[PDB]
Design an enzyme around this catalytic site. Structure first.
Site, PDB file in Angstrom:
ATOM      1  N   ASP B 149       0.805  -1.303  -0.047  1.00 50.95           N
ATOM      2  CA  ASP B 149      -0.054   0.000  -0.033  1.00 50.95           C
ATOM      3  C   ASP B 149       0.880   1.206  -0.024  1.00 50.95           C
ATOM      4  O   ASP B 149       0.451   2.091   0.681  1.00 50.95           O
ATOM      5  CB  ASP B 149      -1.053  -0.015   1.102  1.00 50.95           C
ATOM      6  CG  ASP B 149      -2.160   0.863   0.861  1.00 50.95           C
ATOM      7  OD1 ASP B 149      -3.133   1.003   1.866  1.00 50.95           O
ATOM      8  OD2 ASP B 149      -2.420   1.393  -0.270  1.00 50.95           O
ATOM      9  N   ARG B 153      -0.199   9.090   0.597  1.00 48.58           N
ATOM     10  CA  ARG B 153      -1.298   8.902   1.950  1.00 48.58           C
ATOM     11  C   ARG B 153      -0.859   8.033   2.849  1.00 48.58           C
ATOM     12  O   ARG B 153      -1.200   8.220   3.947  1.00 48.58           O
ATOM     13  CB  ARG B 153      -2.450   8.689   1.255  1.00 48.58           C
ATOM     14  CG  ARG B 153      -2.660   7.252   0.794  1.00 48.58           C
ATOM     15  CD  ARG B 153      -4.139   6.742   0.702  1.00 48.58           C
ATOM     16  NE  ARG B 153      -3.915   5.138  -0.189  1.00 48.58           N
ATOM     17  CZ  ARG B 153      -3.697   5.010  -1.325  1.00 48.58           C
ATOM     18  NH1 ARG B 153      -3.524   6.078  -2.307  1.00 48.58           N
ATOM     19  NH2 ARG B 153      -3.696   3.727  -1.618  1.00 48.58           N
ATOM     20  N   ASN B 154       0.318   7.120   2.905  1.00 48.89           N
ATOM     21  CA  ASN B 154       0.641   6.213   3.479  1.00 48.89           C
ATOM     22  C   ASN B 154       2.172   6.738   3.740  1.00 48.89           C
ATOM     23  O   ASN B 154       2.983   5.810   4.416  1.00 48.89           O
ATOM     24  CB  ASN B 154       0.611   4.969   3.134  1.00 48.89           C
ATOM     25  CG  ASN B 154      -0.739   4.399   3.176  1.00 48.89           C
ATOM     26  OD1 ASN B 154      -1.260   3.559   2.579  1.00 48.89           O
ATOM     27  ND2 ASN B 154      -1.624   5.192   4.219  1.00 48.89           N
TER      28      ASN B 154
END
Ligand SMILES: Nc1ncnc2c1ncn2[C@@H]1O[C@H](COP(=O)(O)OP(=O)(O)CP(=O)(O)O)[C@@H](O)[C@H]1O
Ligand SMILES: [Mg+2]
Ligand SMILES: [Mg+2]
Lengths: 4, 288
Positions: B149, B153-154
Site C-alpha cells: 500500500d 497518503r501512507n
C-alpha cells in the site's frame, strides 16, 4: 475512491 | 480474547487520548500523551484504533497490522511502533507521532503560488524525499516483507522532515513463498498497483517497486493524483494496453526514466530497492  | 504480549504492552492509565489526526472507513488515528513510553524516561504519540462499530474482521485486520510492525523492526524511514494496549479495553496501537502529517497533504500545501490543488519543495528536496523512502523499502524488502500500500497518503513526515513509511494494513510476510497470492477479490489501491497484482493477484517486492514508481510520480507532481482524468474501469483498460503516466513538469529525464523502470511490464526487469537507493544516492551526491 482509492480502494476499488 | 487477544493474546497478551508483555514486551509490547503499555498501561492505559499512562495514556491520554487527544485530538484526531485522521479517520477512515475502518479505523481512526488520534494524538495522545504517553507517560513513560520511553524506557529511559518514566511523550506525544499517535494512537491507531477501531471505529466504535467495528466488526470482528476489522479487529483481526488491525491486529495483523500491529503484528507486521512488531516483526519488521526499527528503521529511520519506517514509522516507529511504540507499544499497544490490548488487554481489558479497546485495542490501541501506539506509534511514533509525525507532526507534519502525510506526504500527500505535505506536498500539496507546499506547491508554488498559482499551482494550488484547489481553493516550497526544491528539486533536491524531492530527490531526498524519494531517497529516504527507497531506503525504507530496501530495509523492508530485506526482511522479505511486502508493503502492498505504498502511496503518498501512507507516508508520514516528522518535525525534522524525515520520511516515514506507514500504514501496514496490507503488508504481508513473504519469507516462505517469495510471493503473496490473494485468492479472492477485494477493494484494493488499484492506481498504485502493478499489472500482475491487479490481474494475476500476485504481489512481490517487484510489485512494491511498481507502487514506489507511482509514489515517485506523486512526489514530483507535488501531490498529484495518479492517472488524471481516468476512471476505475478506464484505468484497467489503459494498463492492459501499455499506458504509463507522463513525465512530471519539474523532473529530469533521468528521474523519469527511473519512474518508468519501476513500471517495466516485466517484473524481474524493474530495479530492486537496493538499486534505486544506489542510483538515488548518486543523483543526490551530484546535486549536492
Ligand atoms: N503517526 C501519525 N502521526 C501523524 N498523523 C498520523 C499518524 N498516523 C496516521 N496519521 C494521519 O492519519 C492518516 C491515516 O493514517 P493510516 O494510514 O494509519 O490510516 P488508514 O488509512 O489505515 C485508515 P482507513 O483504513 O480507515 O482508511 C494519515 O494519512 C495521517 O494524516
Ligand atoms: Mg492509509
Ligand atoms: Mg487501514
Amino acid at each position: 475512491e482509492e480502494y476499488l | 480474547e487477544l493474546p497478551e504480549d508483555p514486551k509490547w504492552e503499555f498501561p492505559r492509565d499512562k495514556l491520554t487520548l487527544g485530538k484526531p489526526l485522521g479517520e477512515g472507513a475502518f479505523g481512526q488515528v488520534v494524538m495522545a500523551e504517553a507517560v513513560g513510553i520511553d524506557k529511559d524516561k518514566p511523550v506525544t504519540v499517535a494512537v491507531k484504533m477501531l471505529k466504535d462499530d467495528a466488526t470482528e474482521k476489522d479487529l483481526s485486520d488491525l491486529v495483523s497490522e500491529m503484528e507486521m510492525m512488531k516483526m519488521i523492526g526499527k528503521h529511520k524511514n519506517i514509522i516507529n511502533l511504540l507499544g499497544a494496549c490490548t488487554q481489558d479495553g479497546p485495542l490501541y496501537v501506539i506509534v511514533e507521532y509525525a507532526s507534519k502529517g502525510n506526504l500527500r497533504e505535505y506536498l500539496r500545501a507546499r506547491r508554488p503560488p498559482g499551482m494550488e490543488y484547489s481553493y516550497q519543495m526544491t528539486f533536491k528536496d524531492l530527490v531526498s524525499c524519494t531517497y529516504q523512502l527507497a531506503r525504507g523499502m530496501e530495509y523492508l524488502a530485506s526482511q522479505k516483507c511486502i508493503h502492498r500500500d505504498l502511496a503518498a497518503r501512507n507516508v508520514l513526515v516528522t518535525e525534522n522532515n524525515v520520511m516515514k513509511i506507514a500504514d501496514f494494513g496490507l503488508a504481508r510476510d513473504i519469507n516462505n513463498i517469495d510471493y503473496y497470492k490473494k485468492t479472492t477479490n477485494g477493494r484494493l489501491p488499484v492506481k498504485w498497483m502493478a499489472p500482475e497484482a491487479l490481474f494475476d493477484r500476485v504481489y512481490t517486492h517487484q510489485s512494491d517497486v511498481w507502487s514506489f514508481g507511482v509514489l515517485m510520480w506523486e512526489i514530483f507532481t507535488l501531490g498529484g493524483s495518479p492517472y488524471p482524468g481516468i476512471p476505475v474501469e478506464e484505468l484497467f483498460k489503459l494498463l492492459k494496453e501499455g499506458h504509463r503516466m507522463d513525465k512530471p513538469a519539474n523532473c529530469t529525464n533521468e528521474l523519469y526514466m527511473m519512474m518508468r523502470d519501476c513500471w517495466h511490464a516485466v517484473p524481474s526487469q524493474r530495479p530492486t530497492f537496493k538499486q534505486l537507493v544506489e542510483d538515488l544516492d548518486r543523483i543526490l551526491t551530484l546535486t549536492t
